[PDB]
Design a protein around this ligand. Structure first.
Ligand SMILES: COC(=O)/C=C/c1ccc(O)cc1
Ligand SMILES: COC(=O)/C=C/c1ccc(O)cc1
Ligand SMILES: Nc1nc2ccccc2[nH]1
Lengths: 185, 188
């Protein structure tokens, strides 16, 4: 991930005019949408939190949690730390990243800072649901000038996605001012 | 560098009792002494700055600055970012690291934050001297509880080291209070 950290613009887009910032959301969304396709109901929820983080929940099968045979860590971790641009890029450029995977009756959690895992992916409880949730706080060492999520920028792109991913429900919620939308084609 | 960041303890030692913190200094010093040893006048200057960074200056030949054939960046950057424990470990666990290399008539400068280079190594100017200066600000996200350098721990070690390195002048300066020491042993 150091290659992403040293030239973030080359991976995510302009880091000063809001371009890169928004592309962080879109990259997570692309992954989430593909999760939703493969598991009944087929809905994602994109939230702009008051603290300027964005979360993206899917009702998919859950990113795989088992130990990757070659890397020695969970498969989810491999995905978050090893170089569509990939979610590893978002993680690398995030001051904090929270990951919650619901899979095979189990809740798994892991926290990252600037792409470094704080601990291994751990089972924290039981659940009847499946899905993946990623909340990230964009690093303010990378993202300058435009540092706040703009609702309409996210809305425009998600609208386009709904048409292209038919049957996938896309919800957008803004906790700063209560704005919400529901794209479903 | 991510392997270090992931488990800092395994590389630098204990990040909570001051051991690791001071080990950062010693690792740099070891490299500096190796540099000073290859030159003739042989001097190193260790300074504790008032912002709790430490700088180490040597009058060696300067860390090589040419682009590394396979890595695609200057040799200095390869040394600072590709993993005693290696200076790359110090860089990784430093919130800021300033690198100044005087070599082949030219001053070279680069800044790192948490091991990440802010720009490629750049020729900023000219010089008649040679040497390598590294100044680092320990990461307070890594180093907890003991976060300030204790002059006495540095002095004791630098005094011991001076006996093992004949001809090498080691100066210790604390800009917080003005304390200075000069350890120079001529043996051999
Ligand atoms: C298993 O396939 C993958 O790489 C999935 C990645 C992924 C899924 C959801 C998300 O919010 C971010 C990343
Ligand atoms: C080939 O040299 C190396 O690997 C490292 C050299 C070096 C590191 C720190 C310092 O203050 C001076 C020199
Ligand atoms: N890799 C890395 N980059 C960082 C930037 C700020 C704080 C901690 C960090 N760790």
């Amino acid at each position: 991930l150091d290659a992403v950290r040293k030239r973030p613009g080359m991976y995510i887009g302009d880091t000063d005019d809001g371009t890169g910032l928004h592309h962080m959301v879109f990259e997570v969304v692309d992954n989430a949408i593909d999760e939703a396709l493969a598991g009944h109901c087929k809905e994602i929820i994109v939230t702009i939190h008051a603290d300027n983080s964005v979360s993206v929940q899917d009702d998919g099968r859950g990113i795989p949690t088992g130990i990757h045979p070659e890397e020695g860590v969970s498969a989810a971790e491999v995905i978050m730390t090893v170089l569509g641009v990939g979610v590893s890029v978002v993680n690398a450029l995030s001051q904090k990243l929270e990951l919650v995977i619901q899979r095979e009756g189990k809740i798994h959690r892991q926290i990252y800072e600037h792409g470094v895992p704080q601990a291994p992916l751990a089972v924290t409880g039981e659940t009847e649901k499946t899905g993946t949730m990623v909340r990230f706080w964009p690093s303010l060492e990378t993202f300058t000038n435009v540092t706040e999520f703009e609702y309409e920028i996210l809305a425009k792109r998600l609208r386009e996605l709904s048409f292209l991913n038919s049957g996938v429900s896309i919800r957008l919620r803004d906790k700063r001012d209560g704005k919400e939308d529901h794209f479903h084609y």
